[PDB]
């Protein structure tokens, strides 16, 4: 399954798609920035593609790895949950939060 | 001072009775006529339609859409629902084979 909407900045351009993922990305809207002149061969997979059908969810499934990750990474537990959720999230452009839109009624989303 | 403030549904039922007993066509001719030419221009250019040709096309389009709307209505009350939904229309097309 492939899409032509590219749900990382809501724009259009050169697209790449994954086999088992229905989300499209540009060559720049990724955590590793890749050029088409030296694109990797074989299958391309997203970050949560690496988190769903690959390690931490197929073998050594996410039972309590957040807590032992907290124990391993010298007690950053007030931020370690966000560090864990970074890996289980696709890269995307910055979007303004909803509660910033209400305080300024003069600006509307394009 | 107090406005009438009709509750929703009663005027909707009243509009049902007023239009089911009516004869005249609800959709205006000019918006429907321009839609026919726009669709036909994607198939064959420089195509004209007669006044009675659009008139025959408009009457069949309303009756087909009304019959779909009746089937959409009884599908809603089958689902213990009052308001029709877009998924109800998709259900009606599949069952009808269209």
């Amino acid at each position: 399954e492939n899409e032509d909407f590219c749900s990382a900045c809501n724009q259009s351009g050169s697209f790449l798609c994954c086999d088992t993922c229905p989300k499209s990305f540009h060559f720049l809207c990724l955590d590793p920035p890749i050029d088409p002149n030296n694109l990797p061969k074989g299958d391309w997979h997203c970050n949560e593609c690496k988190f769903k059908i690959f390690i931490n969810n197929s073998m050594a499934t996410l039972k309590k790895i957040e807590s032992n990750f907290i124990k391993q990474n010298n007690n950053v537990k007030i931020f370690a949950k966000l560090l864990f959720n970074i890996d289980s999230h696709n890269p995307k452009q910055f979007q303004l939060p909803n509660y910033i839109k209400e305080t300024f009624p003069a600006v509307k989303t394009g | 001072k107090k406005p009438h403030r009709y509750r929703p549904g009663t005027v909707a039922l009243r509009e049902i009775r007023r239009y089911q007993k009516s004869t005249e066509l609800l959709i205006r001719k000019l918006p429907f006529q321009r839609l026919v030419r726009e669709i036909a221009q994607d198939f064959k250019t420089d195509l004209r339609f007669q006044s009675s040709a659009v008139m025959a096309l408009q009457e069949a389009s309303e009756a087909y859409l009304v019959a779909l709307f009746e089937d959409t209505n009884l599908a809603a009350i089958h689902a213990k629902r009052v308001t029709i939904m877009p998924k109800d229309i998709q259900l009606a097309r599949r069952i009808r084979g269209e």
Partner: protein
């Protein structure tokens, strides 16, 4: 001719559903039936286009509209 699918206005669809006995109409219904009407119009007119081109005629007659609707089991009386 562009953006002609908006010719079928929102209360015009509401009036059609009032003829069908529909109590309440969702806001997403109007966008759905416009595609349904476009699909239905894209079949009858295309069939009428073949009827018009077969007779070496440049204008689609009401006779060809009736025959286009008749072959799909939706025959129209009164032309």
């Amino acid at each position: 001719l562009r953006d002609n699918i908006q010719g079928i206005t929102k209360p015009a669809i509401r009036r059609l559903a009032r003829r069908g006995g529909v109590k309440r109409i969702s806001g997403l219904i109007y966008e759905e039936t416009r595609g349904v009407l476009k699909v239905f119009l894209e079949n009858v007119i295309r069939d009428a286009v073949t009827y018009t081109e077969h007779a070496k005629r440049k204008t689609v007659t009401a006779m060809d509209v009736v025959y286009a609707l008749k072959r799909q089991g939706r025959t129209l009386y009164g032309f």
